[PDB]
RNA sequence: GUAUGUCAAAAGGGAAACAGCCCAGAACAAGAGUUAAGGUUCCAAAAUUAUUAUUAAGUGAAAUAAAGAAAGUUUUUAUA
RNA sequence: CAGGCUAAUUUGCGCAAGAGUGUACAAAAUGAGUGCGCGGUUUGGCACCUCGAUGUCGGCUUGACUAAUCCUCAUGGAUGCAGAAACUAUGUAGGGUACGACUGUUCGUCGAUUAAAAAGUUACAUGAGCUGGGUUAAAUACGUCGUGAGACAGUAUGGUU
RNA sequence: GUGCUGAAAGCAUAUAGGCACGAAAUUUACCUUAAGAUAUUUCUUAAAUAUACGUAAGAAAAUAUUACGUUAAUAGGCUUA
């Protein structure tokens, strides 16, 4: 029981993560060679990763009942990477229980009214548990079409270097070497 | 029929893998029983029949590991998983030609 | 135009082509013939 | 391709300027393929185009030749564009020096054609409008795209001229779309010696 | 979703961050996209608020008899303009009539205080195509705002019919009268199909209910007469509502706008009848602060009894 | 009718939901215990695990629609 | 009775092949006897649900949906597309498809208009919305059958919705 | 359904690639209802405002909606046309 005794303030805090839908991802890409052929994370492979963060499942204290999820700011959703002809052949449906009122729309036609952010919210929404926390978690996914967003100051940092920045890894290893100078 | 017995016509790579290991585990049971008798200079009519008219997993074709003969099918072949107790039964040889 | 399921060349000038294939549909196989316009055929419905 | 290997004989006066690989940022796409801007200047004008980067041009300024080649012939995408990029450059070279022409013949009683100016519909200052009387209750008038010269040596004969073949042959197709040749009397608009086999009766 | 294909929360405001100057495709939805697909149909000028006074016929000098509805304008003024930068669209707020100060609330008393306009009876916005349609604040619009022969659209609330049945509300045929019919003469009959159709009454089913008292637009009504003295604008045909009800009269959306000369001449008449429409407004806006700052401090009673 | 099993009188895991099918026979608790069928990107416990080919049709991915057509594509065997 | 399973069969269709018709010429039209199928609208087969209760043929009222299209819109082929009209076929279901005589009738026949006066599913949609002419109770008669009481996908008049 | 350029495949080809024509269907437009961001150099320190009551109504099954209440033409009466 001692493992849990302590200050759990920072274990439950909301971290503001960031990812660009255009930056190549060696881990979430199916093409891994050559270096120039690596593609960004596909729609479903990016949503599968985000849904894991919104559920807080990346934390060692995850519990499905506690809403220990985090925020995820997705940028460049206009350049959402998709394979095949999904952009023009995939269809989204709707019905309000009135016979004949079946609304259909393609991915590209849906990206003209509400942009690529709406296509990613539907992918993440289906990957989340269908319960009373689905709308709270999906609201923590802030997707934008370009590189601009109001959370450029919220993104988690480490020594002034935003995570995902060019030199963010060096700033982390420098802070841990200073923490070892103690009993 | 209106009663749904949802059984796919083919097996998955996970079922085929376990099938390979079951065909491989029965080969070790006959090889152990045969080598144990050979050391004593003995033989069993059932063990001599198996080694004579039954192949090993390393000698069977893929179509004999995941399929069986069925005269009611278009091409006289039927998924082995469509056999009763197919997981605890021996089935490796089909009629010649089919 | 005669829409068939088994399109065949009826002369030496008939040509097999796949038209109307774009990012939204797969298209159909046509039998275009400049000599005789009665050799026009299609494979598939919309 | 057997056409891409054929060198492109650059006649006197023509000047080919091969740019360098570039990539225009497209927010809708994650990775644009590099292209090369090729400028073909000469006496009649200047044409341009952007070819893929996998196509390599060996511009031989000494013997006035330019051979095309791709990085991999096993790829269907590179084999196709190899011959297509060659066909377009051929039309550019032979279009900026000599020019492309198209002749339209108007068959049918009462069919005429004259070149006039309609300032009320001028898409640009000094646009020529080909007036066509093809039996319709209303007058048919079409403005020549910027860069084409239209003339009518005779009432039943139009002569289009331009450095871009795609623009010349496309405008002639818009005129012919008003009266397609019929098989019973040959009435219509024939483009570049087009013919139609008439019927018996 | 709640409304449409949008799964976005209702309290987030990401619009300003999805800009087109950044290289993105122009969205198909939104105010800008909505204003672009309505530019051909949006009128150029504003409208006026009139009161339906009755119905008559217009007699021509050669033997023409034309039915028409008489609409009267009662001190119609321009109260405020809506700009695309502050409100997201172009429009003009127009007034009608007057109202006692005691009945007007303090929120609206200060709304008219900062404009120099007496309290009005009603207000309504009339969309315009561009900023050229915005008019000075406080100028009165007379029947000459339109010209004889001009086509307009008259909007108004229809006559209330109360709880209506199936015949008067949906034109149902009813049932038999004497051939054995039993207690079902004006009833609706069946309300749907059996189990195979949902085991439920489908949404949108036409049933009895309240009828009328809704807005109704009559389009393409020519202007037969225009009288500045009487203040009337005679339009052809009928108009929704009762006598003494306010209506909205504006140029037709399905017709080409009036000639460019007329649109300018009318704008030039507002500057003659009201040479100083901004000076009176700036003076009114300046007084609002002086009184507004007095209400804050609490010394308003001193300014009232200043002289 | 016959042969074998289950259900009936059998819960539990898998087959989306499931009397009869694939596993397995519930006396009660504990365990990142060991396994069967079955599975391992997310809903949802576990591989976005390695190797070689094929498909570009979202074909297909846990209920194979037929004969048949065709410069779709790949391999192999001939052959110029 | 309706639903379910099935699909022999149908008053529902398609694809393949091509004897033959088309003055000529297989595939403009036409398509013997067949083969491979879809579909679930007919007559059946089974008897799985309901007999401590699922009201039934037509009509009226009010719908919703399918598309294998009668009209309207775009359009390919047509020795057999001169024009016009029409035939055939590909798109396409937004709207419309009315009136009257006969019959309980669905259906069908017929009169006269019309751009046209096409169909089907929904418990052969809808009787705790209506009607009750038919079918199917007690009464009575005719014919037929039975020795008789009586019976009859035989016919009549009447009959608590 | 009909085209232009044009190769893979020296040709051909409206096949790849680059452009385009085109229907009572669709979408937009137009009309109504809903939605309620937002706007006003708007109001409020215990209020602004709203309701109740009374006279009513462009409203009306109840409810609600929309005006008025003496510094007042809301309803009735009265006078005139
Ligand atoms: K219900
Ligand atoms: K699928
Ligand atoms: K009687
Ligand atoms: K075509
Ligand atoms: Mg079932
Ligand atoms: Mg009333
Ligand atoms: Mg009546
Ligand atoms: Mg009565
Ligand atoms: Mg239900
Ligand atoms: Mg029993
Ligand atoms: Mg069990
Ligand atoms: Mg599963
Ligand atoms: Mg474990
Ligand atoms: Mg997991
Ligand atoms: Mg033709
Ligand atoms: Mg429409
Ligand atoms: Mg019924
Ligand atoms: Mg009922
Ligand atoms: Mg060519
Ligand atoms: Mg060509
Ligand atoms: Mg168009
Ligand atoms: Mg409207
Ligand atoms: Mg304020
Ligand atoms: Mg108060
Ligand atoms: Mg009341
Ligand atoms: Mg009075
Ligand atoms: Zn041919």
Tab-separated table of C-alpha atoms (C1' of nucleotides) and ligand atoms in Angstrom, chain E residues 194, chain G residues 126-129, ligand 18:
chain	number	residue	atom	x	y	z
E	194	UNK	CA	-48.647	-1.634	-38.197
G	126	U	C1'	-54.181	1.046	-41.453
G	127	G	C1'	-61.694	-1.901	-37.996
G	128	A	C1'	-58.756	0.016	-29.081
G	129	G	C1'	-59.516	5.371	-37.168
I	18	LIG	MG1	-55.386	-1.369	-35.113
